[PDB]
Amino acid sequence: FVVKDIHFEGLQRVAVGAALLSMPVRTGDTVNDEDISNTIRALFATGNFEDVRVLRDGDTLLVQVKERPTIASITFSGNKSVKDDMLKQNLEASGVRVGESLDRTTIADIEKGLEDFYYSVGKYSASVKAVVTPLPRNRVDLKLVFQEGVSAEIQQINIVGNHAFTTDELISHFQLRDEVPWWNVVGDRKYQKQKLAGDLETLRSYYLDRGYARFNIDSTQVSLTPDKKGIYVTVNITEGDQYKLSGVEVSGNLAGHSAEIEQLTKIEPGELYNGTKVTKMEDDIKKLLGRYGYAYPRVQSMPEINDADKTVKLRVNVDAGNRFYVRKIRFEGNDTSKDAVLRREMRQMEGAWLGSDLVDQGKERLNRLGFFETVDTDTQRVPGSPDQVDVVYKVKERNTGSFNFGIGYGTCSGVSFQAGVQQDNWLGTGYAVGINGTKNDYQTYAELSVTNPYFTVDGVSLGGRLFYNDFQADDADLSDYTNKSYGTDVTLGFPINEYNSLRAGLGYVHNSLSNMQPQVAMWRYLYSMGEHPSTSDQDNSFKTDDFTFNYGWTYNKLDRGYFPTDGSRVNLTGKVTIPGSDNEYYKVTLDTATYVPIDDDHKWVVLGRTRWGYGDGLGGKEMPFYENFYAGGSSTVRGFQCNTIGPKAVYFSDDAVGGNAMAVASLEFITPTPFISDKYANSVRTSFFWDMGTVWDTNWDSSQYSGYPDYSDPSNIRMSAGIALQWMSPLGPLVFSYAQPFKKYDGDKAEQFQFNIGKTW
Amino acid sequence: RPDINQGNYLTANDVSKIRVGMTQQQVAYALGTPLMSDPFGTNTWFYVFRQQPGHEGVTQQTLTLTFNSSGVLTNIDNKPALS
Amino acid sequence: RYKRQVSGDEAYLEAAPLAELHAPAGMILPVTSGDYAIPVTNGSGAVGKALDIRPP
Amino acid sequence: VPDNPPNEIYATAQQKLQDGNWRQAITQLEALDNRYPFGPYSQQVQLDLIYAYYKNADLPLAQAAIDRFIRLNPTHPNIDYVMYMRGLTNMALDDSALQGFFGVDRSDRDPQHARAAFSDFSKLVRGYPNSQYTTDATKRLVFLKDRLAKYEYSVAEYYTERGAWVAVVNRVEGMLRDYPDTQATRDALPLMENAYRQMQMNAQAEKVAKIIAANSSN
Amino acid sequence: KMSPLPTVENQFTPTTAWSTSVGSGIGNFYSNLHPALADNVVYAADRAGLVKALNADDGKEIWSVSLAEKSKEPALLSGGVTVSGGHVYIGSEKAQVYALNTSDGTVAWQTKVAGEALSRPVVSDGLVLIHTSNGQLQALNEADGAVKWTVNLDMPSLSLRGESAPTTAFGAAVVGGDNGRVSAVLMEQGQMIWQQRISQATGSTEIDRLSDVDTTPVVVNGVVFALAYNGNLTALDLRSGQIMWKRELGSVNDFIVDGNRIYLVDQNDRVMALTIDGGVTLWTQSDLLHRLLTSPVLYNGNLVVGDSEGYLHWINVEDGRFVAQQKVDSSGFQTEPVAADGKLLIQAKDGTVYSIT
């Protein structure tokens, strides 16, 4: 026409120049007659103008045009098994997100896509609706109202062509369940597209090992009600006839290992063809060829059937890949842990040939120490390399130290404050220490202990220990006399076998005893040494300082430390007096446990725990009582108090005393917990238990105090059972438990709820 | 107590396939790579069969080779066993 | 919570020198990738903590 | 979480920045993103967010922010800020003093972060040799050079104490091909001098003799 | 969701003849199976294996029998209910097909097919025509169950029920089948004379593609009509199937056409009368919604069905206004009554028949 200029009104988010550019007509030139069509197609090709209204005065074009309002917040109402993040993902898949304008009319198609997702779950009756909220500044909010309806169960699982061999109960091996016992209640019946796909191959696998080789599927058909309430599923198959194998052979390059594969393929004649046996056999070959140093061969297993006699001859073919070696190793995870620390568990070495087996021994040795949370191995091929290879060992670290806190809970340190801390990966080095300082304002007990497990290469261990201790509580004058004592321990440690370890070392102690009660079992010892200063005296006092020797034996074979699942760990210690000393005796303690799963898959597991304790003197003499055993404290015996177990002393009745005979165990049922997700489910452990223990002395007699009971007997057995929660937290391990005792006697005590914080399995 | 291997494997009849006037690639297809290789000139290669198992007992073979600019041999040296 | 002092970074903590390497008589050094290396440049102006990060 | 026009919001953003306050400016800036994800000064907003992540040290968020930015903004003059800040991130990612109390060697840990830092500073120089970010960046690259050297040196020590007489040297040839500097490297030749003689390789020990004799005192 | 009950009314007595408690029922399971008449008798059974033989005027057993997999595993009978020539011809879940005599509960023969042994068999000059979920259409003998020919058809991954209501004319035989495809075919080798599509492919395989399965067409006079769920109600040629008109509508259950009107329902359970040759709704009644209802018949000049609440939904034919109502049973229904020529009746899910006044 004749327009000379353009003005726009109602655009608050976009340039007018681009607007007038999207149409060919412009200001400063003769515009055309298509200007209305150009305004139309451009302003609605933008997708950012909801309505346009353009008019020409004769010299100037006035455009009155709005901009499509843009979404601010996308909100959800009616979520019950569905999370808004995946829904926003589905929206971005739609092509829609916050800060975008739109038509307000694809809402129906949007609802349909949402409902298609809902179909993908297994609900088809639902209905969704939008709630639009107009807002100034050309804005909107949007909310989503849902009515999910309900899903279906499955009603029958009926199968075709399954004659002459039933599975209509043996189907129960599937993921899916078309029957929920009212006496085995859990879960319900729900369909899924893919769990189907899994159980189908499962069923195939079943028939593949009972003497069949042609069990094929025709089809799989499913439908359901018009009211969409329950499903009807069917599947169409063949059943051919039974089958057998007839001989086996191979082919391909080796290094003359024919006689070994000969053993893995080895069979008896006249046996049923399988395919799982086949597969594990293949992989066993792969393991062997790992060991001799191969990674990437190829393997093929071909049935050569004769259905004329229902037999097969299994042709096999291998292609031994060209040899490899290793070049390099690299580690990731180490932020708080030095290098050279993990190589000293690699029984593999760098820069030489290779197996596939040293790798796993290293995995084991690593997961033992608990310096890592989790593990990952891998194996690459180097670029531009047929034979050179590298490796990776990744980990996730863990903070593993502690902060012990003894308060004399249960009165084995009475009213006291035992503080202290332990860490075995001290500052990320292979170095281990532990400390306590103990104060009561009259009591002292401080102790240090240290070990370098790798003083020298090849797992050479070296440890020291020291303790100072003062005890001042006989101004109570109740029991448990005043002692001061201090000493040292030193130790070597080393292995000989690649799992089993030994150690030994020495010690020196110094002891000072004061304000002895008139307790009765003591004077047994006091005759044993010699002199007897009794009447009823309390100026009583004594001293003795002694050298000594000890040693340790170790069988450790686990999947790992830090909440293991498999194997067993046992440690024995024998300690002994030595000559040139104030006394003579010897004791031994053993601590045992073993982990066995169901399958280590869902982790339905059991542990067994036991301890043994014994000791005796020499020369017809007895050992001291302060080196006695003890029990109780709800770490060793759950549902009982600290050092509150077993026999007890008198003067002419209470307050158990410890001794020299022990036999104690606890048998468990290990459990997962469904109420928490993996994120910490890896790091928590719950169980039930059933605990036994009993105690006595051999030096104890009953011919003289016989109106008082026996304590020599191994009878009078302590029994309880309960439940325990065990959970990791940044301060160390943590555990609670609640039990119920069911065999007490007199002279004893306990609690039901108990707490522990340290290192005890 | 520990065990160690180190070096390049041997077939010991591979050795009966070695003739001067043969490209390095022929030995590549023969062996796979070497690992020790002169970073001071004199195009040459090394091949060794060391192992140290047991509290005692030690062994090592060696073959040591030098070639032309052509990536083809000039001369060898079999040290079958250390001393 | 919401105030801590186990990390106080953005500190210049270096002093380190550099040196370069001769060759022997006769025979030869080993070759270099150049992948890790120093395109030399005149250093000047701000450096170390005496330095800006307050953005533009 | 108020809702307002963005001008006052960026205003209080600047205010809280001058306050040294992160936890307030943090949410302010996240709301500036979400409320105005295509504002006219969006880029400055991204910068301020990464500055926030540094001054409060939520690091991998900042890493993601930077690679987001460089993906989406490939080109503008302040890019140098971006690259340098990335490398500073990973430089921090290596370091710590949770263990440092005047006594730790931070060496001998997972070094890949340093390699990323190396590449980052290097790239930024190679695109932008001339800025006001470089006079220290060079020296920091030198730091990482020394550290990567020391990493391998320590591994050499352990393998050497075993007697992996050869895999060591296969490491060290690469130590040479990469690191012609760093006295440790000069201090590491003698390990070969022991090695080749443990190998009963005489004919290369003289090469070791020459190189050591070729060098003066370390 | 589900509509509330309307008031009971009258203008005709809510009448009941005898009833009988019969078999152990069949339960929650959807099926298509409901009894079938003969001279002075009707017959039915359960899926369990147990079968009857009755009267027409007392409903007592002239005799009753049962079978099972020989041991004694579930019989699972959900075929049809049909007679011919003093013999009965029934199917299971199992692709196993049962030929007995009417005079006694004894085998004529027993045979095997592919695919489930579903919906109501139909027979003409002998020559039974049978269908499955597999989409496989077999053609059968009269005294050994021998096959004469068989057809393959496409099937989807999903459906509501692969079902069928095959129908014939001049020895020319027709039926639908899934995918909204219909085939009009021979009776000798059964091979294709022609086909026709009427459905619409518009959804995402679960919105449309729910009109895939075809319940039932039926002939009038050189013409047929048909439908599927959320599909098109059609008018198609006997010789060719070419289209005369269509109505974007839906249902799942069978219809009926007598007079100048056609009488059928909605998937939402609403009922109407449309024209013979058009599709112009004279009227609807829309009261009894989401009620899980069954297809009607005519009896003495009006229509009724039953429900999952077990009631009777009598109406006026001319406008559908409710004329009468009866509560008759607490077990509801799943399937269809019938009557014929003096006698009306229905079976329960739970093993209960009603004979009707």
Swiss-Prot record, chain A:
Residues 1-68, 69-149, 152-240, 243-321, 324-398 form the POTRA domain. Disruption phenotype: Deletion is lethal. Depletion results in the accumulation of incorrectly assembled outer membrane proteins, including TolC, OmpF, OmpC and OmpA. Decreased expression leads to decreased susceptibility to contact-dependent growth inhibition (CDI), and decreased expression of outer membrane proteins (including in this study LamB) as well as up-regulation of periplasmic protease DegP. Residues 1-401, 424-431, 453-460, 484-499, 555-567, 597-605, 670-683, 729 are periplasmic. Keywords: Cell adhesion, Cell outer membrane, Membrane, Repeat, Signal, Transmembrane, Transmembrane beta strand. The chain crosses the membrane at residues 402-410, 413-423, 432-439, 443-452, 461-472, 482-483, 500-512, 541-554, 568-577, 586-596, 606-616, 660-669, 684-696, 719-728, 730-740, 755-759. PROSITE patterns: POTRA. Residues 411-412, 440-442, 473-481, 513-540, 578-585, 617-659, 697-718, 741-754 are extracellular. It is found in: Cell outer membrane. Coiled coil: none annotated. Belongs to the BamA family. This is Outer membrane protein assembly factor BamA. It comes from Escherichia coli (strain K12).
From Swiss-Prot, chain B:
Transmembrane segments: none annotated. GO terms for biological process: Gram-negative-bacterium-type cell outer membrane assembly; protein insertion into membrane; response to antibiotic. It is a lipid-anchor. It comes from the Bacteria. Disruption phenotype: Mutants show minor defects in the assembly of outer membrane proteins. Keywords: Cell outer membrane, Lipoprotein, Membrane, Palmitate, Signal. Belongs to the BamE family. Part of the outer membrane protein assembly complex (Bam), which is involved in assembly and insertion of beta-barrel proteins into the outer membrane. Nonessential member of the complex that stabilizes the interaction between the essential proteins BamA and BamD. May modulate the conformation of BamA, likely through interactions with BamD. Efficient substrate folding and insertion into the outer membrane requires all 5 subunits. This is Outer membrane protein assembly factor BamE. It comes from Escherichia coli (strain K12). The gene is bamE. The chain holds residues 29 to 111 of 113 of the full protein.
From Swiss-Prot, chain C:
Part of the outer membrane protein assembly complex (Bam), which is involved in assembly and insertion of beta-barrel proteins into the outer membrane. Nonessential member of the complex that stabilizes the interaction between the essential proteins BamA and BamD. Efficient substrate folding and insertion into the outer membrane requires all 5 subunits. It comes from Escherichia coli (strain K12). The chain holds residues 30 to 85 of 344 of the full protein. Part of the Bam complex, which is composed of the outer membrane protein BamA, and four lipoproteins BamB, BamC, BamD and BamE. Forms a subcomplex with BamD and BamE. The Bam complex has the shape of a hat, with the BamA beta-barrel crown in the outer membrane and the periplasmic brim formed by the BamA POTRA domains and the 4 lipoproteins. It is found in: Cell outer membrane. The lineage of its organism: Bacteria, Pseudomonadati, Pseudomonadota, Gammaproteobacteria, Enterobacterales. This is Outer membrane protein assembly factor BamC. Transmembrane segments: none annotated. Belongs to the BamC family.
Curated annotation (Swiss-Prot), chain D:
It comes from the Bacteria. The keyword Signal applies. GO terms for biological process: Gram-negative-bacterium-type cell outer membrane assembly; protein insertion into membrane. Disulfide bonds: none annotated. GO terms for cellular component: Bam protein complex; cell outer membrane; membrane. Disruption phenotype: Depletion decreases the density of outer membrane proteins, but does not significantly affect transport of lipopolysaccharides to the outer membrane. The keyword Signal applies. It is a lipid-anchor. It is found in: Cell outer membrane. Pfam families: YfiO (PF13525). Keywords: Cell outer membrane, Lipoprotein, Membrane, Palmitate, Signal. The N-terminal may interact with various proteins as a chaperone to assist in the folding and insertion of proteins into the outer membrane. The C-terminal region may serve as the link between BamA, BamC and BamE. NCBIfam families: OM_YfiO, PRK10866.1. Belongs to the BamD family. Part of the Bam complex, which is composed of the outer membrane protein BamA, and four lipoproteins BamB, BamC, BamD and BamE. Forms a subcomplex with BamC and BamE. Interacts directly with BamA. The Bam complex has the shape of a hat, with the BamA beta-barrel crown in the outer membrane and the periplasmic brim formed by the BamA POTRA domains and the 4 lipoproteins. HAMAP family: OM_assembly_BamD. This is Outer membrane protein assembly factor BamD. It comes from Escherichia coli (strain K12).
